[PDB]
Design an enzyme around this catalytic site. Structure first.
Site, PDB file in Angstrom:
ATOM      1  N   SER A  19      39.494  36.076  50.424  1.00 13.54           N
ATOM      2  CA  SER A  19      40.682  35.949  49.581  1.00 13.54           C
ATOM      3  C   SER A  19      41.223  34.535  49.483  1.00 13.54           C
ATOM      4  O   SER A  19      42.111  34.301  48.649  1.00 13.54           O
ATOM      5  CB  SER A  19      41.849  36.770  50.094  1.00 13.54           C
ATOM      6  OG  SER A  19      41.679  38.189  49.932  1.00 13.54           O
ATOM      7  N   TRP A  74      43.409  46.932  47.460  1.00 10.81           N
ATOM      8  CA  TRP A  74      44.366  45.908  47.887  1.00 10.81           C
ATOM      9  C   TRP A  74      44.928  45.139  46.691  1.00 10.81           C
ATOM     10  O   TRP A  74      44.749  43.928  46.522  1.00 10.81           O
ATOM     11  CB  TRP A  74      43.822  44.962  48.962  1.00 10.81           C
ATOM     12  CG  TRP A  74      44.956  44.286  49.682  1.00 10.81           C
ATOM     13  CD1 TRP A  74      45.741  43.263  49.214  1.00 10.81           C
ATOM     14  CD2 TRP A  74      45.449  44.600  50.987  1.00 10.81           C
ATOM     15  NE1 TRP A  74      46.682  42.924  50.151  1.00 10.81           N
ATOM     16  CE2 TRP A  74      46.524  43.728  51.250  1.00 10.81           C
ATOM     17  CE3 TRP A  74      45.081  45.531  51.964  1.00 10.81           C
ATOM     18  CZ2 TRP A  74      47.234  43.760  52.448  1.00 10.81           C
ATOM     19  CZ3 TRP A  74      45.786  45.559  53.153  1.00 10.81           C
ATOM     20  CH2 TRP A  74      46.849  44.679  53.385  1.00 10.81           C
ATOM     21  N   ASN A  82      44.323  41.745  44.712  1.00 13.53           N
ATOM     22  CA  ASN A  82      42.967  41.610  44.168  1.00 13.53           C
ATOM     23  C   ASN A  82      42.927  41.777  42.649  1.00 13.53           C
ATOM     24  O   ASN A  82      42.241  41.005  41.967  1.00 13.53           O
ATOM     25  CB  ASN A  82      42.024  42.590  44.845  1.00 13.53           C
ATOM     26  CG  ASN A  82      41.452  42.041  46.131  1.00 13.53           C
ATOM     27  OD1 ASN A  82      41.232  40.823  46.257  1.00 13.53           O
ATOM     28  ND2 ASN A  82      41.180  42.916  47.064  1.00 13.53           N
ATOM     29  N   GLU A  87      33.188  41.942  44.974  1.00 13.35           N
ATOM     30  CA  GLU A  87      31.829  41.555  45.357  1.00 13.35           C
ATOM     31  C   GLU A  87      31.778  40.248  46.138  1.00 13.35           C
ATOM     32  O   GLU A  87      30.868  40.055  46.952  1.00 13.35           O
ATOM     33  CB  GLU A  87      30.934  41.477  44.116  1.00 13.35           C
ATOM     34  CG  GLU A  87      30.621  42.828  43.449  1.00 13.35           C
ATOM     35  CD  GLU A  87      31.710  43.349  42.498  1.00 13.35           C
ATOM     36  OE1 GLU A  87      32.715  42.649  42.222  1.00 13.35           O
ATOM     37  OE2 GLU A  87      31.545  44.487  42.008  1.00 13.35           O
TER      38      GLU A  87
HETATM   39  C1  LIG Z   1      41.207  38.909  51.004  1.00 10.88           C
HETATM   40  O1  LIG Z   1      40.331  38.369  51.694  1.00 10.88           O
HETATM   41  N1  LIG Z   1      41.404  40.242  50.929  1.00 10.88           N
HETATM   42  C2  LIG Z   1      42.525  40.792  50.141  1.00 10.88           C
HETATM   43  C3  LIG Z   1      43.525  41.643  51.038  1.00 10.88           C
HETATM   44  N2  LIG Z   1      44.392  40.757  51.942  1.00 10.88           N
HETATM   45  O2  LIG Z   1      43.738  40.290  53.063  1.00 10.88           O
HETATM   46  S1  LIG Z   1      44.059  38.639  53.343  1.00 10.88           S
HETATM   47  O3  LIG Z   1      43.387  38.349  54.568  1.00 10.88           O
HETATM   48  O4  LIG Z   1      43.640  37.860  52.217  1.00 10.88           O
HETATM   49  O5  LIG Z   1      45.495  38.690  53.451  1.00 10.88           O
HETATM   50  C4  LIG Z   1      42.671  42.678  51.881  1.00 10.88           C
HETATM   51  C5  LIG Z   1      41.447  42.037  52.592  1.00 10.88           C
HETATM   52  C6  LIG Z   1      40.570  41.128  51.656  1.00 10.88           C
HETATM   53  C7  LIG Z   1      39.698  41.973  50.732  1.00 10.88           C
HETATM   54  O6  LIG Z   1      39.741  41.797  49.497  1.00 10.88           O
HETATM   55  N3  LIG Z   1      38.840  42.881  51.266  1.00 10.88           N
HETATM   56  C8  LIG Z   1      37.951  43.698  50.447  1.00 10.88           C
HETATM   57  C9  LIG Z   1      38.644  45.028  50.150  1.00 10.88           C
HETATM   58  C10 LIG Z   1      38.817  45.820  51.432  1.00 10.88           C
HETATM   59  N4  LIG Z   1      37.492  46.186  51.955  1.00 10.88           N
HETATM   60  C11 LIG Z   1      36.729  44.963  52.366  1.00 10.88           C
HETATM   61  C12 LIG Z   1      36.581  43.981  51.182  1.00 10.88           C
END
Ligand SMILES: *C(=O)N1C[C@H](NOS(=O)(=O)O)CC[C@H]1C(=O)NC1CCNCC1
EC number: 3.5.2.6
Length: 268
Positions: free
Chosen positions: A45, A80, A107, A143
């Site tokens: 992210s 998310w 996202n 992805e």
């Molecule tokens: C970012 O890496 N994200 C978006 C959201 N916030 O986490 S942070 O660390 O940026 O604050 C959730 C985790 C992550 C993400 O997009 N993860 C995907 C969706 C959840 N399953 C794994 C992949």
């Protein structure tokens, strides 16, 4: 002025069970702390901070962009999307999507803004335009989170992240109003309380952006920090690990940030 004072990063990453990449710069003196700083790590992210900066750069030539209302369908709402799911039936402005992408790591907001810029290649082009030859975004959410060992897609280095962050928040890559808006968005981040911020005294201003890929022990944070009475510090901490089911650690990121500040001689 690099690594004038050694710090136990190797022991930290061995305790973690993976690799930690750190690059921290005192913008007053130019002193730096650097550990695996030119290795590639997945952005996860954390690309969303640079995405918002690219939107602000475009807004310098488009006074109406930030307040433009964007409607989207339910098919835009991937995992998310905590802010954009609450405005599905109304839409949100470009500025609200940018704030959501930065401050809640939203996202769906990130994908909508990527589309506005011409996709991953458009964000990569913005980073090239500020002199960053390392950053690459290749895929969309979700992805881009695959975090495959040895895969350079959707990666940068801690050093290039820190250098680009400094240009955008403290240097001249954005005009002054947009620079302050970018800083304000980073300062309002809600997802980083257990990472770099946990190493920073409460009376110092911080702006940051996190990332957590969800595999291969891969997670990160970058930040600008304003210790009172001295020049700001810019730093990036990225992690990964060899096994797909390895878990990330917020504590390791906080610990690495503490070692970086100690290596710069910043009293916390
Ligand atoms: C970012 O890496 N994200 C978006 C959201 N916030 O986490 S942070 O660390 O940026 O604050 C959730 C985790 C992550 C993400 O997009 N993860 C995907 C969706 C959840 N399953 C794994 C992949």
């Amino acid at each position: 002025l690099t690594n004038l004072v050694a710090e136990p990063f190797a022991k930290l990453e061995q305790d973690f069970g993976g690799s930690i990449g750190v690059y921290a710069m005192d913008t007053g003196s130019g002193a730096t702390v650097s550990y695996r700083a030119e290795e590639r790590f997945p952005l996860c992210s954390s690309f969303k901070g640079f995405l918002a900066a690219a939107v602000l750069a475009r807004s310098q030539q488009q006074a109406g962009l930030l307040d433009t209302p964007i409607r989207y369908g339910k098919n835009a709402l991937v995992r998310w999307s905590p802010i954009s799911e609450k405005y599905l039936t109304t839409g949100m402005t470009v500025a609200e999507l940018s704030a959501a992408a930065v401050q809640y790591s939203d996202n769906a907001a990130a994908n909508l803004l990527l589309k506005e810029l011409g996709g991953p290649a458009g964000l990569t082009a913005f980073m090239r335009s500020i002199g960053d030859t390392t950053f690459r975004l290749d895929r969309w959410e979700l992805e881009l989170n695959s975090a495959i060992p040895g895969d350079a897609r959707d990666t940068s280095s801690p050093r290039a992240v820190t250098e680009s962050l400094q240009k955008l928040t403290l240097g001249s890559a954005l005009a002054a109003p947009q620079r302050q808006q970018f800083v304000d968005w980073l300062k309002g981040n809600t997802t980083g309380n257990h990472r770099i911020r946990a190493a920073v005294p409460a009376d110092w201003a911080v702006g940051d952006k996190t990332g957590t890929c969800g595999g291969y022990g891969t997670a990160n944070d970058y930040a600008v920090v304003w210790p009172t009475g001295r020049a700001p510090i810019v730093l990036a901490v990225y992690t990964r690990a060899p096994n797909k089911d390895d878990k990330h650690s917020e504590a390791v990121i906080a610990a690495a940030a503490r070692l970086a500040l100690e290596g710069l001689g910043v009293n916390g």
